[PDB]
Design an enzyme around this catalytic site. Sequence first.
Site, PDB file in Angstrom:
ATOM      1  N   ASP A  16       3.029   2.889  -3.063  1.00 39.44           N
ATOM      2  CA  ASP A  16       2.324   3.738  -2.122  1.00 39.44           C
ATOM      3  C   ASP A  16       2.809   3.427  -0.717  1.00 39.44           C
ATOM      4  OD1 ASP A  16       0.272   5.814  -1.680  1.00 39.44           O
ATOM      5  OD2 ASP A  16      -0.747   4.231  -0.549  1.00 39.44           O
ATOM      6  N   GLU A  18       2.343   4.323   3.716  1.00 40.49           N
ATOM      7  CA  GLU A  18       1.676   4.935   4.852  1.00 40.49           C
ATOM      8  C   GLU A  18       2.786   5.366   5.793  1.00 40.49           C
ATOM      9  OE1 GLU A  18      -2.057   4.336   3.192  1.00 40.49           O
ATOM     10  OE2 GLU A  18      -1.410   5.598   4.866  1.00 40.49           O
ATOM     11  N   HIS A 174      -6.694   3.527   3.924  1.00 38.72           N
ATOM     12  CA  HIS A 174      -5.475   3.742   4.695  1.00 38.72           C
ATOM     13  C   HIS A 174      -4.507   2.566   4.586  1.00 38.72           C
ATOM     14  CE1 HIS A 174      -7.549   7.220   6.082  1.00 38.72           C
ATOM     15  NE2 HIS A 174      -8.393   6.554   6.848  1.00 38.72           N
ATOM     16  N   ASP A 179      -4.389   0.924  -1.726  1.00 34.85           N
ATOM     17  CA  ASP A 179      -4.119   2.127  -2.513  1.00 34.85           C
ATOM     18  C   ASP A 179      -3.239   1.839  -3.717  1.00 34.85           C
ATOM     19  OD1 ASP A 179      -5.688   3.780  -1.021  1.00 34.85           O
ATOM     20  OD2 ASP A 179      -4.037   4.670   0.132  1.00 34.85           O
TER      21      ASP A 179
END
Lengths: 208, 206
Positions: A16, A18, A174, A179
């Site tokens: 994952d 960001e 976030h 995540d």
Amino acid sequence: TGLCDRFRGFYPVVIDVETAGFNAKTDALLEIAAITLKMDEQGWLMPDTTLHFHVEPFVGANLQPEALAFNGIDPNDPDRGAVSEYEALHEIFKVVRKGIKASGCNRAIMVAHNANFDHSFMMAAAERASLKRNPFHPFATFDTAALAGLALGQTVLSKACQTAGMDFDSTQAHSALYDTERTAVLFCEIVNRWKRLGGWPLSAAEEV
Amino acid sequence: TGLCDRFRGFYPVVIDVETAGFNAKTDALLEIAAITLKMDEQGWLMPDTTLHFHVEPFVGANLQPEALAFNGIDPNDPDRGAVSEYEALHEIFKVVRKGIKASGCNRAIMVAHNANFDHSFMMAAAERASLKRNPFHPFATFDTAALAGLALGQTVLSKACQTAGMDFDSTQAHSALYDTERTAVLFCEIVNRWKRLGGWPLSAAE
């Protein structure tokens, strides 16, 4: 009951990211996490190695204000302990190649939620870093949004985790690492439930 | 046991395309097929409406020779009965909005094998054509390659179909329509077996 038997040689790695926008080509990668998986002798699936990095925006990257407002990341904070895209991916790839070799798989496949998004960012970054011998399949993924749709009737990550009887803390949503860990646990639950209920292996349905 | 209950209000539509290259933005869309699904009264999923089109390359589109050699399409053959992207997609969207309304769903989700590819071509075509109110979800898909990986331990469409006890005729593999109906039957078989084995409804296991 080998990992290499489960997905025709594919070595699943949960990923994952960001980011600082929606464009994998032009927007900065700000965080990335990776979790390899492993099977026990009974063929049950579970997390193996966990990696996580704050990532420095590549030279020339765009930073969409809305993205930063959304994920709350501030790339200019000197205390965020960021490393280069090269350093993060080089280490992820090293761990992934070793797992592939140790398990007898032939290629890694990214597991992610709405996977294409995360896939495109990881590939774009590995391209920028001139990383050689990318162990990941060029276009194939395991999208946990689709998988959760099938198994749990839900496609939103938090709802899917809840429906799976998992915890999910909104204040951590976030964070790539958070995540990725939730996504890995979800994925494992889905694969494992399928086996448990006698859908795997394919011979099970007729035995007993 | 309603279709709208199964995927939090998503209306699955099976889609496959044939193209003249790997780039959704620059390369022509040459064929598209769509198959809506339906659930009977016992909540078993099956194919509903089937659409299929040969598509005229958009003005200024690139045609990669390798792609035409691979899929065997000749865009210049006047007998292929092609329609514009607008015509094709407008008809599909019309059928899809109707299905969505009748079943009480909120939005359509594309079902496809390695879905992102087909999704990006459909979306790019819908854009070029200036279509209003696209009923499809902007980024969510159901990738049957991943579902077959879960259900059947196979990610190649042909092998996953055979593993599922389906027939698969390789001589037809370059037809969007053929690929779409095999993919639809595969998706249904996967959803259906999950139900039969007690995976759905969530309450069923007890």
